Each structure stands twice: as structure tokens, then as C-alpha cells.
């Protein structure tokens, strides 16, 4: 007890918060600060030195800077990926059965059903790269959700996490590569790829460095990376040959029949009236994804649920359809 309450002199008044740079195998690490002060001191207790993941903020002192403790960082990583297993499988959507069996056969052959993968002796651990004209996570998450049935998943949506802060660099990509290293049986999903589309000179070098570390120059077959953008013309031609090496496919235009199937899937569990017609619903829409029709299915089920009824009448589903007609025109 006294030995536990005797190191209080180091963590007392002379205490600071620094940024550690790296750990040296010679039991003396190098730290930094706003002016970059490098002090090497033999390690102390309360530190892990293994899960610390150097390159983050640690605790320093006004003394010789003996490391007395650490502080966890980035709660921002929590909003990166989902850890749940949704019930949406590859058999819940139709029409693109070949388009979904191309990626299912593409990334579900490694690490699962390995007699057609390890006996051949190819191992292209790169995965396909897709793009959805509707986007907004509906089609791209309806194709990536096939891998989410029984497996670990890794999700990355939007290039904002690189542009919402100072140019720290590819260190966050190194965090995704170390969590993918410690989580090898996973699927890397990059969504809303608009790095160059949205300083600007550093975005090109952290994007080309993203291509460098994404190529896997030192790592063996560890994880299948699946990228997903919105516009194929925003990506430079240099990000294609190193990144996309397995296969790519095209997605048809969802005008009437794909919106009819999306409407059927979004209206399969719900109960609708007999007078609810389909031609006006697949007619009034114009280049719409599934998030807004899911929004009017939610507010239509709640609005119809106001009368303590689960049946959605035709006039109430057109009254909710006015949100679709207005939102895309606004």
C-alpha cells in the first residue's frame, strides 16, 4: 500500500501531458511536445509498453520526465466501424444475383471455403472495388452486408476524418492497418471516397500514401479490402492499377425495376392496403436511393401507427411520398 502510494511525488504537482513518439528496445523511449522535447528515461510502473501503440499523447512531468502513466486516445475510433451482425443477408435482395455472387465469390473464397482458394496457389489479397450510382450506403452496404453475416467487419465512411483535422498524415491509416492486422479475419470497407473531390496539396500525398500502405508491400495475405466510391471519374488513374487488381463491375440504372425491387424489399415486412398502387410510386421517383424511401417507410409506419394501426393506406403513403417528391427537388 505504501509502495503504491509512494510514487505520488512524481505524479503530483510537477506533471504534464506530452506526446510520445516511439519506444526503443533499450528501455528508454522518446517523447515530444509542442516544441518537441526528447527525453529518454527508464520505464516505470503503470505502463503497458505493448498495447501503448506509440505515437499518441502520454503523461509527462516538470521533472526529468519519467513516464508515470498514460492516457487513452481517440474515442473517435468508436464511430469508425460497426461490431454488430445485421440479419440482412445476400438472399434478401434480388435482380443482381450475379452482381452479388461476384463479390461473394470474390471475397468469401479466402479464409472461408478454402479448397478453391489455397489449392490453386494464387492468393490475391486485394479484393474488388465497387461504386454505387445511388450510393448513400444503401447499395454499397447491401453488397458489403453479405460479408457481415458471420464474420468480423471493418467500415470506413467518408474522407472527412482526414480533412476534419490538421494534416497528421497516414497515421490513422496505420491505425486501420494495425486493427486489421490484429483483426485479420475481417473485411476492409472504404465508403464515400471523395478525398480529392472535396491543405489540398497534402490530400494528394496522403492519398498516394494511402495507396502505398494499402498495396501491402510488407504484409502477406491478411485481409480483403473492398473500396466503394460514388463517382468513378473523381479517382485519379494512378489509384487504379495498384489498388484495383482483382476485378471491378458496373451497376445498372435504378429507374423503374430496381426501384420496384427496392420498394418490394422495403415493403415486404410492412403491411400495406390493397388500393396502394405501384406505378405512381415507381413513376414519381427520379434517381433516388433507398435511404429516402426507407425514411418514408419509417415515417409512414409511424404516421400510420399514430392511429394504432399497422396498415399503411394509399393516401397516407402518397402523403409520405410528397416528402420524396419534395426532398429531391429541394
Amino acid at each position: 500500500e505504501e509502495e503504491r502510494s509512494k510514487v505520488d511525488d512524481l505524479r503530483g504537482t510537477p506533471m504534464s501531458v506530452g506526446t510520445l513518439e516511439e519506444i526503443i528496445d533499450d528501455n528508454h523511449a522518446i517523447v515530444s511536445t509542442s516544441v518537441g522535447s526528447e527525453h529518454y528515461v527508464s520505464i516505470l510502473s503503470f505502463v503497458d509498453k505493448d498495447l501503448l501503440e506509440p505515437g499518441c499523447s502520454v503523461l509527462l512531468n516538470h521533472k526529468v520526465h519519467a513516464v508515470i502513466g498514460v492516457l487513452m486516445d481517440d474515442p473517435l475510433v468508436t464511430v469508425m466501424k460497426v461490431e454488430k451482425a445485421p440479419q440482412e443477408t445476400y438472399a434478401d435482395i434480388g435482380g443482381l444475383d450475379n452482381q452479388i455472387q461476384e463479390i461473394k465469390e470474390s471475397v468469401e473464397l479466402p479464409l472461408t471455403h478454402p479448397e478453391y482458394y489455397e489449392e490453386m496457389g494464387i492468393k490475391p489479397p486485394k479484393g474488388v472495388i465497387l461504386y454505387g450510382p445511388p450510393g448513400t450506403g444503401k447499395t454499397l452496404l447491401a453488397k458489403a452486408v453479405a460479408n457481415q453475416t458471420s464474420a468480423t467487419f471493418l467500415r470506413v465512411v467518408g474522407s472527412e476524418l482526414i480533412q476534419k483535422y490538421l494534416g497528421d498524415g497516414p497515421k490513422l491509416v496505420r491505425e486501420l492497418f494495425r486493427v486489421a492486422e490484429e483483426h485479420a479475419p475481417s473485411i476492409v470497407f472504404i465508403d464515400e471516397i471523395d478525398a480529392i473531390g472535396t491543405g489540398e496539396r497534402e490530400i494528394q500525398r496522403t492519398m498516394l500514401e494511402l495507396l502505398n500502405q494499402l498495396d501491402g508491400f510488407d504484409s502477406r495475405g491478411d485481409v480483403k479490402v473492398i473500396m466503394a466510391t460514388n463517382r468513378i471519374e473523381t479517382l485519379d488513374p494512378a489509384l487504379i492499377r495498384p489498388g484495383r487488381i482483382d476485378r471491378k463491375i458496373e451497376f445498372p440504372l435504378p429507374d423503374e425495376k430496381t426501384k420496384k425491387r427496392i420498394f418490394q424489399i422495403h415493403t415486404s415486412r410492412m403491411t400495406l392496403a390493397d388500393d396502394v398502387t405501384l406505378d405512381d410510386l415507381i413513376m414519381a421517383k427520379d434517381d433516388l436511393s433507398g435511404a429516402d424511401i426507407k425514411a418514408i417507410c419509417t415515417e409512414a409506419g409511424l404516421m400510420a401507427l399514430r392511429e394504432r394501426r399497422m396498415k399503411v393506406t394509399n393516401e397516407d403513403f402518397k402523403k409520405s411520398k410528397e416528402n420524396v417528391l419534395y426532398k429531391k427537388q429541394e
Binding site: 479464409l111 472461408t112 458471420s150 464474420a151 468480423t152 485479420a184 479475419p185
Partner: protein, 686 residues
């Protein structure tokens, strides 16, 4: 409507005003009233009033049941003796008589210990058999034998709803919330109604719980009368325990009507369908015998290659990869590799003699001792392989029959239930050799012979091993593995006072108090006895750091069914022994992602015993995500036990006592490698 015309009618206490006003209350009693029966302050004089007094009692119990009461509601009905699909009968009978007769049976069941409550219970039984809303009135009438005439009075045509629903949730809440004797009423009455009905395999589970000799007879003359066959012989032999197989083969050898139940009663017809069908439709890869048989070295990973080699019993290449592989191996590996031929020859009974005969009567005593171990493992019903070992038995210090006693007595206990194995085991335990595994495989042998016995015998067998247990207080490993067999004899029942008899003649210095707490472990297979759960939390903080491990390790056996309460804050503590208690208490279940998380946190540790004993349950609970923990151990290690045990985790990856005894005996790995010579002969694996 308004109470203007009918309100001044209940105030007159005259007999005609009651005999005409009360029928109007029965007419308007279809929905009770227009309100919550606020007329209590006006009918409280009718309470004291009395021609149609049973109607006054009916309306009185109607209003008292309507607003609130705990004891005064069913009195007008036990005194009334009611004689005078609508909404009236549904309201006044269904819910009002549901809670009414429920609180009457509860108050009369807890207060006093005549027949009026039985007449009410049968009347409500019939009325709620007409109501046809199941499991509500049932789940209320559980606690009131009367349940026998209730089930045989109800189980006539509704079989799927009462059997599936009532037996499912009433059996779950009958092992969870109901004590033992009423569960025995479930077993006997379920033997009745299920004997008169179909679905024999659930009655066979009622034989897994009853362990009675009549159920198998009636289900074999009825299953024989009702015409696959080898399949129900397979799970027939799986569901049966050590007693009713021996008794089953002696009653079927007493009847000998067809000898097909004699053929199915042994291990031959449970293995002859499996092996060819497994070799045909499944094709295991050779990259794990060549790979996992190639990265081995240091004379220990090679032992892990003898165990992975023992996994085959399709491909028998690593088995028949020439010779000298056992000659290069040391004693700790001569016994294990000697038993590898027994692990790889679980089938091919006739071939076992011509495969093991080459190593029999050899020059090294351990080669032929482990060869007799193989002869004991390969067979369990042939009983024609243990003649030479059982013959001599005469060394009294050491001549090939203390090690041949290890392999032949252990493998014979695995293949054991006659007295004329214990009349010969009397000089075995009476020998008192310095070798631990002599009394080890002796107590485990007779213990596995005495599992599931007729409530447990306290004869000179366990009395002899207790007296000779307390003979000398040296090599306390004897005190660690003799309570193993003691508990194997105490196993099979919880209510017995035999554990308190051990608390009488056993209690001593904390060695035999640890014996007594092992008897406490195995003498509490499981029931509704939360008293030992709060007592578990009370004695959980004992200074002795081993009775915590075993007595707290009993968690996986006590609450083995209700797995929602098994996860607790044992990992949040600071004692490494508790981390072992949870780590072993994970189990060998289907291995949900929560368990894989508990191994994702328990895996990272610094002690070689916990990091050594994590992959056993980690890969036992998961037999996609199978290769990730192996890569994790490759990243942690790259000691010897971690590499041999991670290759043994490559072995593991790719309510009977036979699946409970081996690992509970295996909970002694924190010692010399002598225990690891008994590690290679586990039988709990599938």
C-alpha cells in the same frame, strides 16, 4: 347508464329485493359494471346480509375479487360450492377465478399443510380446459399428487401444445425454479402420459434423467413393436449411462428375443456406422499432419504431433510413417506415443490385435504398458484384451505392472462393471506405490465405474481409499486426485447427505477439507439450490487458493443449463486463481462471440499456467475464426508449453459423465509433466 334506477335497489336488505336485484347483477355482470365497482361502500351492508344467499356470496366474491382482496375472495366460493364462449364466464371465471383460485391454492399451500381446494382445483381445471388458453392457468397451477391426475386428466389429445409448451417451459422452470421432488413428479407422470403417447426419444431423455430399468424395457418392447434402427441404436447408446447399458445388456441377454438390442447395447454398433460414413463423405486435408507434423521439434511439439496424430480416430499416412518415431521419443512421449496407436485405432477391433501385437511383450516396459493402454482405449465391450495385464498383477514394488497397471487399469476403467475388477483392485490401492498415477488411475478407474450408481455406495471401496488416503500425509497430489474418484462416486445426486457424511468422517487439516470441498463440487450436479450460490459467494473469499479454484470451478457444472447467469465479474477481480476459475468455467459449448471475447481478454496474460490453460477451453468451445487465435499465439510466443499447447490447440480446433470426468481430472496441469502423460488419454473429445 346512470345508477339512478338500480342504486336504491341494493340498499334494501329484504329477501325478495335480493332474489330479484341480484339476477339483474348477473345479467349486467357480462362486463362487470359501467365502472370500477365503486359501490363497495353500499354493498358492505350486503356483506352482513344474507333467500338466495349463494348469489350474495357470488356477487360478494365478484366485487371483492373486482377491487382488491387477498384472503376474503375465495371464502364465498369455498363456502358457496358453486351450483348457480361468452364474456361473463370468461371474465368471472378466467381472470377472476384464475387469480382467485391461484391465491386460494397459494394461501392454502403455504399456510396449512381438506378436499374443497381439490374440488376448486378440478373445477377450475375443467373450466380452463374449456377455455383452452394454455400455460397460463398451467403456470399458475404448477405449485399444487394432484399434478398427476391433472396431467392424465388433461393429456388426452393435446400433445404438441402441452408436451412441447408445458414440458419445455415447465421443464426449464422445473430445473430452474422448481425443487427436486416435483421434478421427480414430472419424471414419473411424464413417464405415464409420455408412455401412453408418441415421441419415444423425449422419454429416452426421461431415461437419461430417471435412470430407471423399466423405461428402457417398455421403450424397447414399444420401440420394437413400432417399426431407422442403427441411428436410434447410436443415440440410444449415447443417451444411456454406465449403469443401464450393463443392466441393459444383462436384461437383453436374459430375454435374447432378437439379440439386436444386445448388438446395439455395446460400442460396436455405435462405431460401425460412423467410421465408414465419416471417411466417405468427409475428406480431411493432409496439410495439418504434414504441416502440424512438420513444424515439430524439441521432443514436445513432436508429442503435440502424436496428439494431432491421434486426432484421426481418413488419412492414415502420419500414423504409418515408418518406424523409429517412438524410439526417438522419450518416456514422456513413449507413453503418450504408445497411446497414440490407441487413439488412432478406435475402430478396427480385429486389426487392433495385429497392429499392437508388434509392440506387445517388448523390451521397454513403457512400450508394452502403453500398448496395453492402447488395448484398453481401442475397445470398451470386447473384454478379451486385458488378460495378460490382469493375470500377473504381482510385483509389490515395480515390475512392468505398475505402468501396465496405469495403462490397463485406466484403459480398463474407460472400458469397464463387475466386482471381479475391484477384488483385483484391492491390492492395487493397497499397494501404495510412490507413483502418483497408480492411485490416480485407480481412483479414477473405480470412480468412473461407480458413476451414476444406486444413490452412491459408502462401502469399503471409498472407505478404503479414504483410510488409505489418510494413511500417509505425503505427496498431496494423492489428496488432489483421490477426491476425483470420490466425487465420481458421489456424482449423480445432489440431495444426498453423503457429502455431510464426508463432512463427518473426512474433515481434518485443509488437505482433507479440500477433499471435502471436492465432494462438495461433484455432489452438487445441479438443481434449484441458490443457497449454495450465496454460500458460494460467501466462501468465495477463502484464504486457501485451491478450494477457490475447484469449489468455484464447480460453476460450469452447477449452472450448466442456464448459461445466461454464468458470465459474471470473475474476470474483473485481481486474483489469478479467479481468472483461472472463469477461464476453465467457459466450457465446451457452442462458443458464441461473447466467449471468444472472454478469451480475447483472458488470452493476453503473462503467467505460463494461464497462458498455457487458455487454448484448452478456447479451442474446446470452438470445434472462419478458428485460425485467428492460433496466429495470436504465434504473435505472443513468436515457452515450450505454449507451442506444444498451441499445436494441441490445432488438435482441438480441427449430460453424460464421459464428457465431464476427463477435463475435471485434467485440472491438475500446474505440476510436473507426469500429469501430461495422462493428458493424452482424454475421452471427453468428440
Amino acid at each position: 347508464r346512470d345508477k339512478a334506477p338500480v342504486q336504491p335497489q341494493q340498499s334494501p336488505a329484504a329477501a325478495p329485493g335480493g332474489t330479484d336485484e341480484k339476477p339483474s347483477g348477473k345479467e349486467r355482470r357480462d362486463a362487470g359494471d359501467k365502472d370500477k365497482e365503486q359501490e363497495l361502500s353500499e354493498e358492505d351492508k350486503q356483506l352482513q346480509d344474507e333467500l338466495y344467499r349463494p348469489a350474495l356470496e357470488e356477487l360478494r366474491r365478484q366485487i371483492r375479487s373486482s377491487t382488491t382482496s387477498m384472503t376474503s375472495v375465495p371464502k364465498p366460493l369455498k363456502f358457496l360450492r358453486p351450483h348457480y364462449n361468452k364474456r361473463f364466464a370468461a371474465d368471472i371465471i378466467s381472470v377472476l377465478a384464475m387469480t382467485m383460485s391461484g391465491e386460494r391454492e397459494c394461501l392454502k399451500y403455504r399456510l396449512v399443510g381438506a378436499g374443497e381446494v381439490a374440488k376448486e382445483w378440478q373445477e377450475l381445471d375443467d373450466a380452463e380446459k374449456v377455455q383452452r388458453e394454455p400455460l397460463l392457468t398451467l403456470v399458475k397451477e404448477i405449485v399444487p399428487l394432484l399434478m398427476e391426475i391433472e396431467q392424465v386428466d388433461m393429456l388426452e389429445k393435446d400433445i404438441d401444445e402441452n408436451a412441447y409448451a408445458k414440458v419445455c417451459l415447465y421443464l426449464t422452470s422445473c430445473v430452474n425454479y422448481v425443487p427436486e421432488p416435483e421434478n421427480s413428479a414430472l419424471l414419473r407422470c411424464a413417464l405415464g402420459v409420455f408412455r401412453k403417447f408418441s415421441r419415444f426419444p423425449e422419454a429416452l431423455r426421461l431415461a437419461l434423467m430417471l435412470n430407471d430399468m423399466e423405461l428402457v424395457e417398455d421403450i424397447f418392447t414399444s420401440c420394437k413393436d413400432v417399426v431407422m434402427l442403427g441411428r436410434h441404436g447410436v443415440f440410444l447408446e449415447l443417451s444411456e449411462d454406465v449403469e443401464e447399458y450393463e443392466d441393459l445388456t444383462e436384461i437383453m441377454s436374459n430375454v435374447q428375443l432378437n439379440s439386436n438390442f444386445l448388438a446395439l447395447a455395446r460400442e460396436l454398433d455405435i462405431m460401425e456406422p460412423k467410421v465408414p460414413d465419416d471417411i466417405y463423405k468427409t475428406h480431411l486435408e493432409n496439410n495439418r499432419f504434414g504441416g502440424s507434423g512438420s513444424q515439430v521439434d524439441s521432443a514436445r511439439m513432436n508429442l503435440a504431433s502424436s496428439f494431432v496424430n491421434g486426432f484421426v480416430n481418413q488419412d492414415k499416412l502420419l500414423t504409418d510413417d515408418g518406424n523409429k518415431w517412438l524410439y526417438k521419443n522419450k518416456d514422456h512421449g513413449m507413453l503418450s506415443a504408445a497411446a497414440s496407436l490407441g487413439m488412432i485405432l478406435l475402430w478396427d477391433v480385429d486389426g487392433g490385435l495385429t497392429q499392437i501385437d508388434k509392440y506387445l511383450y517388448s523390451s521397454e516396459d513403457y512400450i508394452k504398458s502403453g500398448a496395453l493402454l492402447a488395448c484398453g482405449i481401442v475397445n470398451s465391450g470386447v473384454r478379451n484384451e486385458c488378460d495378460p495385464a490382469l493375470a500377473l498383477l504381482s510385483d509389490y514394488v515395480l515390475h512392468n505392472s505398475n505402468t501396465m497397471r496405469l495403462g490397463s487399469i485406466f484403459g480398463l476403467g474407460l472400458a469397464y462393471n463387475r466386482e471381479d475388477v475391484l477384488t483385483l483392485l484391492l491390492p492395487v490401492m493397497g499397494d501404495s506405490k510412490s507413483s502418483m498415477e497408480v492411485a490416480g488411475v485407480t481412483a479414477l478407474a473405480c470412480g468412473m465405474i461407480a458413476v451414476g450408481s444406486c444413490n452412491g455406495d459408502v462401502t469399503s471401496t471409498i472407505l478404503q481409499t479414504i483410510m488409505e488416503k489418510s494413511e500417509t500425509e505425503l505427496k498431496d497430489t494423492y489428496a488432489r486426485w483421490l477426491p476425483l474418484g470420490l466425487g465420481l462416486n458421489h456424482l449423480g445426486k445432489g440431495e444426498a447427505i453423503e457429502a455431510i457424511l464426508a463432512a463427518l468422517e473426512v474433515v481434518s487439516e485443509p488437505f482433507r477439507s479440500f477433499a471435502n470441498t471436492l465432494v462438495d463440487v461433484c455432489a452438487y450436479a445441479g438443481s434449484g439450490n441458490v443457497l449454495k450460490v450465496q454460500q458460494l459467494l460467501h466462501i468465495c473469499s477463502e484464504h486457501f487458493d485451491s478450494k477457490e479454484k475447484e469449489e468455484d470451478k464447480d460453476k460450469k457444472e452447477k449452472k450448466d443449463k442456464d448459461k445466461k447467469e454464468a458470465p459474471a465479474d470473475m474476470g474483473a477481480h485481481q486474483g489469478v486463481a479467479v481468472l483461472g476459475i472463469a477461464l476453465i468455467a467457459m466450457g465446451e459449448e457452442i462458443g458464441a462471440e461473447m466467449a471468444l471475447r472472454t478469451f480475447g481478454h483472458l488470452l493476453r496474460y503473462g503467467e505460463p499456467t494461464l497462458r498455457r490453460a487458455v487454448p484448452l477451453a478456447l479451442a474446446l468451445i470452438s470445434v472462419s475464426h478458428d485460425a485467428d487465435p492460433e496466429v495470436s499465439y504465434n504473435s505472443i510466443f513468436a515457452a515450450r508449453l505454449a507451442a506444444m499447447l498451441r499445436q494441441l490447440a490445432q488438435y482441438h480446433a480441427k449430460k453424460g459423465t464421459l464428457t465431464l470426468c476427463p477435463y475435471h481430472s485434467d485440472r491438475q496441469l500446474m505440476s510436473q509433466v507426469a500429469v501430461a502423460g495422462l493428458l493424452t488419454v482424454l475421452v471427453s473429445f468428440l
